[PDB]
Amino acid sequence: HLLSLTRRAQKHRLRDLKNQVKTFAEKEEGGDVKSVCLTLFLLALRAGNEHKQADELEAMMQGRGFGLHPAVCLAIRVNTFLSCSQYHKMYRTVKATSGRQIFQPLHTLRNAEKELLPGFHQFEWQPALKNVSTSWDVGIIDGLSGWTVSVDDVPADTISRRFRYDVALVSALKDLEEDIMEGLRERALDDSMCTSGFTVVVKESCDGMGDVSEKHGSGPAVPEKAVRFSFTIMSISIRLEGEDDGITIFQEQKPNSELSCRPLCLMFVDESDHETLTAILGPVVAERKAMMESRLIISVGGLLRSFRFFFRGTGYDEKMVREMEGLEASGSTYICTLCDSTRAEASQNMVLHSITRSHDENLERYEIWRKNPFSESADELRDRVKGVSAKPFMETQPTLDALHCDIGNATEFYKIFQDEIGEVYQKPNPSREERRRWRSTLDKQLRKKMKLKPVMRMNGNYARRLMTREAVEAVCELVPSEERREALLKLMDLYLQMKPVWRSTCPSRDCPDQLCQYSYNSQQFADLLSSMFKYRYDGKITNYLHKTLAHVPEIVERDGSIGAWASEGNESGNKLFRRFRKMNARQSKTFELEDILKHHWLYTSKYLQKFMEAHK
Amino acid sequence: HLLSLTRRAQKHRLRDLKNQVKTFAEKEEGGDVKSVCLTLFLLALRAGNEHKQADELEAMMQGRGFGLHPAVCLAIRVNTFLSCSQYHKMYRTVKATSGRQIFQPLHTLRNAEKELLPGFHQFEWQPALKNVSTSWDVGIIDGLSGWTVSVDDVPADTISRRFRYDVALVSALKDLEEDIMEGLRERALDDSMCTSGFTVVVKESCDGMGDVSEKHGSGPAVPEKAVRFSFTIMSISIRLEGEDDGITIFQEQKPNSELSCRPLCLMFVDESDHETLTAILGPVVAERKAMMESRLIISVGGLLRSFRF
Amino acid sequence: RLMTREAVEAVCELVPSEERREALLKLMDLYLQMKPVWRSTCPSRDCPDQLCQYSYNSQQFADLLSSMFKYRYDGKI
DNA sequence: CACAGTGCTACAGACTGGAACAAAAACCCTGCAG
DNA sequence: CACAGTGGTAGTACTCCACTGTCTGGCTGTACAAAAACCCTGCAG
Ligand SMILES: [Ca+2]
Ligand SMILES: [Ca+2]
Ligand SMILES: [Ca+2]
Ligand SMILES: [Ca+2]
Ligand SMILES: [Zn+2]
């Protein structure tokens, strides 16, 4: 039987059928090799018909894959942290032994890639963007942006890589086309109609990172600290044709997750030195400023449609909020980024203030400090300008950061407990010896009951586990006085009562009663602090206690949320950055930022995360 | 446009084609429609096929797949550094789309390796070892080795784990059986005979490792530095019946590789202090010093054979 | 990477004196040529000549150390 | 003279196509053989 | 009131190893008509 001989062997057999199919291809199709054999064989198998093969023969060509489709292979490789070379190892293994290979080769995965990265879909900005090129196919650009490397100027030491802003925007926006059209159908809105009234709200974050080791390479020399600038799409809603203040279509269900945080720019720069950070990150701010005005026109769902963008920079820590706005940092006399009170007026009256600071007034105050029209002395001009000693570089929405606020308050209560173990308000001047002894007994008691090893620095998780009532009642037994016990216990209770207003995604729905009583509860909190703990809070408050006892109701009223705009998305993305610089990038100084950027853009797509569930 | 019409139009689109095919089958191959129509695709596609033509054509009734043996799946999982939960994610995704499931579930892998780990094969020493129990199924044993944790003594601040020496050795030797049999074959020495004089030379190594971060956990408090005792089978040779110092069979071609270094004991202990290190590592050195004397008996390649170390 | 010869060539350029520039290069040469005996897997096969010459080469290395670097290797080895 | 990778790029071998050839595998078929 | 994990164990839920008859859906030889959609041509502005 011919099924036992080689494929070369068969030469003599099928000559006449090849002649017949070549003659037949002319008169009806023109060269269609596939169909003339496909519809013949699939139907001739069903002549003596068992359906066992009818399933195998139906999906063989068109839908879907046969084997698993290349896009499914790409998703099951990116979303499980499989290195390319490990995947090729698995591919060879599953194919050579009993295959019938299922996965696709590497070079066809790499070909289904150029559709996901930016620089593939066409778009149009109306009107034309200001001092921004109109070419829509730019991929990964080097962040140096044309430095005249010549030796006599400032050196070009910094390596950097970045997409263009609008191109990554339109790609990460067209990726959500599935869910935007499904929201359009769910709300049952008109499709052909109401195409130009969309509105996008986008949270962007910035952050630095320490002790990133460096490599030998070939140069140039580079610092260890790395800086990562990334953005995330929070919500997309519709406006036309009337007032209809909000008609949401898509809202990110989990804004703090890794899976929704899109990297835009990576640098090997320190955060401290302003010169290099501003030189590299200048073009991004110019793109943002020129993009806030114009409207995007994108082909989605079969039709071209017009979008507008709204940016809210909220993912910055206080060090960077003060750097990017020129204020002095951070143990300064002026504690609040939003208000103008000094340390004294904020230890005196804790719970009454109003938000004033913004971008435009800070620019104008730098102008006043520089022109100095009244010939004032330095120390008093500083008070007249209220801490603006530098020109603001970038606009950030006036909001509080959740995670570092929780950490600040947890370190504050940890210091209070330490003071309490010993008697601090009887003997006001202790030594370092007794301080270390009190800290040691506090850590031993916390480890014995709460199951918490000591910490070098207060990370978020130790701050969630420390400020709970079990821990306080585990430290209440150490403090001998029976009145201080009740005091700090009611303090912890008030704090646990006011926490979910700021730490929740939407306090307006998940915890309305705690929202309604935040002002009064903070009043009682500050009253207990002023009364009983005055030995510690006479004239010195931390800047986070002020932010959380004065400005929280106004913040949650302005936008409607706090924790949903936290810096979690970037902080946690740093983990992905480290695991992608060690496992998935070329080991060289020249190329490796490009690989981390590409793989981290692929991990954070929605279209490749649709296949991880595959309808359960 | 030939994309989606039903049967009874392609019927008369290809009536003459199928009549000619049946005529050819009757003229030369008797008339077996299936064998003809299955082979029609081979040459028509192969004029220009990429590679997937051959795969989807060999996807015929033969093969076949139902999926790889669970051992191959286990090897893929332990050699691509895939976490168990990530592997289950891959399994669910590959079965839900177009499956036809290939990979095995987790619960059949968990019983698939019960042979590879120690404490499975039967073995016995002679003469019986000193100060070592004869149970041959001891798996992962806690290294503390019966410390009377009671408060007044020196406390047990150490979390450690270790395989017993003899059991991990007989499993690492029973695993290399393929290569020692193949060496006997290539060397053209008789397999059944002169099986009593083997000799196994084993390189052992001990090392510490700094700044292993501690966990919150329950207790007790533990230092951060860890110590990792491991060993590796360097070479195995034959001497019997004699006249040769040795006749080598298996020699590790890549001794320094990370693929050939078998861990034996893990501890959370500092290297500087001596009392904790020696109290944990007492038993290992004891049964090692007691093992150099006697000879091991294993059932390998079908027969009972004797080993020295 | 630093024990190779083309690396001693980048250092010999900073040393102003010439006799020392030759001395340290002769030292690097002797070392590159006695290293593979104890770094190789099986020196009895891959490099037999270096194994046969290790005694004389070590003698000469020690002689050069005592001669032109005595100020450092008087009593600390 | 650690060693298993770290991904992208480059070019080596595996394919067709008729022309035509040889060697071989093995049926069957004739010569010369008792 | 982050969040996606980390592997093992107990529990539920289901989907199957064998015996059995019965049932429907869909294959095959041409004949027979109803719809499909251009294209012709026919008669009219
Ligand atoms: Ca940081
Ligand atoms: Ca920082
Ligand atoms: Ca050490
Ligand atoms: Ca060491
Ligand atoms: Zn304020």
Determine the longest span between alpha carbons in chain A, in angstroms: 110
In three-state secondary structure terms, A207 is: strand
Q: How many helices (H) and strands (E) does chain C have?
A: 5, 0
State which approach was used to obtain the coordinates: cryo-EM
DSSP state of A23: H
Residue A458's identity, in one-letter code, is M
- Residue A357 and residue A363 in contact, taking contact as beta carbons nearer than 8 Å: no
- Rounded (10°) angle between helices A518-532 and A482-503: 150
- Nucleotide closest to B44 measured between CA and C1': D16
CA neighbor of B265 nearest in space, from B85, B153, B145, B151: B145
What does each C-alpha distance from B52 to A55, A540, B60 come to in angstroms?
A: 18, 73, 13
In three-state secondary structure terms, A131 is: coil
CA neighbor of A175 nearest in space, from A603, A616, A495, A614: A603
Q: Which residues contact A189 (CB under 8 A, 6 or more apart)?
A: A238, A247
DSSP state of B259: T
Cβ distance B34 to A28 less than 8 Å, yes or no, reads no
Nearest CA in chain A to B58: A100
Give B162's strand partners. Answer: B141, B265
Backbone angles phi, psi at A479, to 5 degrees: -70, 120
The CB-side HSE value for A341 (13 A sphere, CA atoms) comes to 24
CA neighbor of A350 nearest in space, from A519, A467, A558, A562: A519
CA neighbor of A569 nearest in space, from A165, A175, A212, A254: A254
The helix or strand, by DSSP H or E, that contains position B57, with its residue range, turns out to be: helix B52-58
Letter string b/e over residues B134-166, b meaning 16 or more CB atoms within 10 A of that residue's CB: eebeeeebebbeebeeeeeeeebebbbebbbbb
Residue A64 with chain B: CB contacts under 8 Å: 97-98
Please calculate the CA angle A446-A450-A451 and round it to the nearest 5 degrees.
Answer: 90
The binding site of B consists of: 207
Query: Tokens 């695991």 sit at which residue?
Result: A579
| Cβ neighbours, 10 Å, residue A426 | 8
Q: Please list all protein residues whose beta carbon sits less than 5 angstroms from ligand 5, which is an ion.
A: A 336, 339, 353
Q: Which ligand is nearest to the CA of A577?
A: 1
DSSP state of A554: H
Please calculate the CA angle A328-A334-A340 and round it to the nearest 5 degrees.
Answer: 115
Q: Which residues contact A579 (CB under 8 A, 6 or more apart)?
A: A81
First to last CA, chain A: 45
Strand E bases within 7 angstroms of protein beta carbons: 1-9, 26-28, 30
Distance CA A134, CA A123 (A): 9
Q: Is the peptide bond before A241 cis (omega within 30 degrees of 0)?
A: yes
Distance CA B82, CA B228 (A): 23
As given in the structure block, the two tokens for residue B196 are 């009593």
Cβ distance A37 to B41 less than 8 Å, yes or no, reads yes
Distance CA A329, CA A321 (A): 9
Nearest CB partner across the interface for A65, out of B39, B41, B98: B98
| Cβ neighbours, 10 Å, residue A39 | 19
As given in the structure block, the two tokens for residue B123 are 């073995």
Can you say how many angstroms the Cα of residue A565 is from the centroid of all Cα atoms in its chain? 10
Backbone angles phi, psi at B76, to 5 degrees: -60, -45
Can you say how many angstroms the Cα of residue B58 is from the centroid of all Cα atoms in its chain? 30
Measured in angstroms, the CA of A60 and the nearest CA of chain B are apart by: 7
**CA A64, A67, A68, A74: dihedral to nearest 10 degrees?**
-120
- Residue A236 and residue A230 in contact, taking contact as beta carbons nearer than 8 Å: no
Distance CA B3, CA A39 (A): 10
Nearest CB partner across the interface for A100, out of B55, B218, B219: B55
As given in the structure block, the two tokens for residue A88 are 């090729």
Q: Which ligand is nearest to the CA of A322?
A: 2
Cβ distance B13 to A32 less than 8 Å, yes or no, reads no
Nearest CB partner across the interface for A611, out of B14, B82, B93: B93
Q: Please report the sign of the dihedral spanned by the C-alpha atoms of residue A273, residue A278, residue A279, residue A284.
A: positive
As given in the structure block, the two tokens for residue A225 are 């600290």
Distance CA A581, CA A579 (A): 6
Distance CA B281, CA B279 (A): 6
Please calculate the CA angle A101-A107-A112 and round it to the nearest 5 degrees.
Answer: 100
User: Which residues of chain B come before a gap where C and the next N are over 2.5 Å apart?
Assistant: none
Question: What is the spatial distance, in angstroms and rounded to an integer, between the CA atom of A588 and the C1' atom of D5?
Answer: 13
Please calculate the CA angle B148-B152-B158 and round it to the nearest 5 degrees.
Answer: 50
Question: What is the spatial distance, in angstroms and rounded to an integer, between the CA atom of B3 and the C1' atom of E41?
Answer: 33
Strand D bases within 7 angstroms of protein beta carbons: 1-9, 15-17, 20
- Residue B158 and residue B267 in contact, taking contact as beta carbons nearer than 8 Å: yes
CA neighbor of A334 nearest in space, from A323, A345, A319, A321: A345
The helix or strand, by DSSP H or E, that contains position B23, with its residue range, turns out to be: helix B15-24
Cβ distance B17 to A3 less than 8 Å, yes or no, reads no
As given in the structure block, the two tokens for residue A587 are 């080991």
Residue A259 with chain B: CB contacts under 8 Å: none
Three-state SS for A74-111 is HHHHHCCCCCHHHHHHHHHHHHHCCCCCCCCCHHHHCC
Distance CA A493, CA A528 (A): 12
Q: Which residues contact A40 (CB under 8 A, 6 or more apart)?
A: B14, B17, B18, B21, B37, B40
Distance CA B235, CA B252 (A): 6
Determine the longest span between alpha carbons in chain C, in angstroms: 42
CA neighbor of C42 nearest in space, from A597, A475, B251: B251
- Give me the total of CB pairs closer than 8 Å, taking one residue from chain A and one from chain B: 159
Strands A160-162 and B295-300, by their bridges, are unpaired
As given in the structure block, the two tokens for residue A112 are 């289904």
Burial of A526 (0-12, 13-18, 19+ CB in 10 A): buried
Distance CA C31, CA C4 (A): 9
Q: Which residues contact A317 (CB under 8 A, 6 or more apart)?
A: A207, A401, A404, A567
**CA A577, A578, A579, A585: dihedral to nearest 10 degrees?**
70
Distance CA B283, CA B143 (A): 9
Question: What is the spatial distance, in angstroms and rounded to an integer, between the CA atom of B72 and the C1' atom of D11?
Answer: 33
Give A207's strand partners. Answer: A228
Distance in Å, CA A247 to ligand 1 centroid: 36
Distance CA C47, CA C40 (A): 9
Q: Which residues contact A408 (CB under 8 A, 6 or more apart)?
A: A542, A544, A545
Nearest CA in chain B to A36: B14
Residue B67's identity, in one-letter code, is G
The binding site of B for a divalent metal cation consists of: 207
Distance CA B268, CA B160 (A): 6
- Residue A396 and residue A440 in contact, taking contact as beta carbons nearer than 8 Å: no
Q: Which residues contact B15 (CB under 8 A, 6 or more apart)?
A: none
Contacts of A102-108 with CB under 8 Å at 24 or more apart are A102/A67, A102/A68, A102/B94, A102/B102, A103/A67, A103/A68, A103/A73, A104/A67, A104/A68, A104/A70, A104/A73, A105/B51, A108/A70
Distance in Å, CA B207 to ligand 4 centroid: 6
Backbone angles phi, psi at A84, to 5 degrees: -55, -45
| DSSP secondary structure, B156-195, as one string | ----EEE--HHHHHHHHHHHTHHHHHHHHHHTT--SSSS-
| Cβ neighbours, 10 Å, residue A259 | 17
Cβ distance B40 to A75 less than 8 Å, yes or no, reads no
User: Which residues of chain A come before a gap where C and the next N are over 2.5 Å apart?
Assistant: none
| Cβ neighbours, 10 Å, residue A432 | 7
Distance CA A8, CA B101 (A): 33
* Alpha-helical regions (H) of A222-358: 274-291, 318-324, 343-348
Contacts of B182-188 with CB under 8 Å at 24 or more apart are B183/B249, B183/B250, B184/B249, B187/B247, B187/B249
